[PDB]
Amino acid sequence: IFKPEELRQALMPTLEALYRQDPESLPFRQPVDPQLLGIPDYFDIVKSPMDLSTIKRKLDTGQYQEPWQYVDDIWLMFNNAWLYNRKTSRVYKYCSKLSEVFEQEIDPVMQSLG
Numbered sequence: 001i002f003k004p005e006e007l008r009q010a011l012m013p014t015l016e017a018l019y020r021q022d023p024e025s026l027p028f029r030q031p032v033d034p035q036l037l038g039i040p041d042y043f044d045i046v047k048s049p050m051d052l053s054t055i056k057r058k059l060d061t062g063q064y065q066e067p068w069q070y071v072d073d074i075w076l077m078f079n080n081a082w083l084y085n086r087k088t089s090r091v092y093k094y095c096s097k098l099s100e101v102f103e104q105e106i107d108p109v110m111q112s113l114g
């Protein structure tokens, strides 16, 4: 059993560390808006959109029951970006950089919660 405040206290620093990567987090701070970006097939390819602001809101409002659900949303966000974009693209490279920041910080936190 994990209380929402316990999850917020433990996990919010890991999310904030991603936000503090600038410019790498900028594309991830807002939901992808295909109409703004001229990528009309986006929602045909990415079936379950996710972004940092959604994850933040879910942590803030206690929508995770256990911490691996938070990890799942983080990884879904990255998988969506790696899927839609080419390996040579800026957003793919930024995705990878954020994913490495996450990888390095997440286990000490998960180990403490478990």
Ligand SMILES: COc1ccc(CCc2nc3cc(-c4c(C)noc4C)ccc3n2C[C@H](C)N2CCOCC2)cc1Cl
Pocket: 023, 024, 026, 027, 028, 032, 033, 037, 039, 080, 081, 084, 085, 090, 091, 094
């Ligand atoms: C700072 O990094 C960027 C800045 C601009 C671009 C080109 C445009 C773009 N290309 C974008 C690509 C994505 C994206 C993501 C993330 N996953 O699939 C797609 C597509 C999301 C947003 C994207 N955006 C929008 C950017 C970030 N603006 C948001 C509004 O404020 C100014 C900056 C790309 C990048 Cl990687």
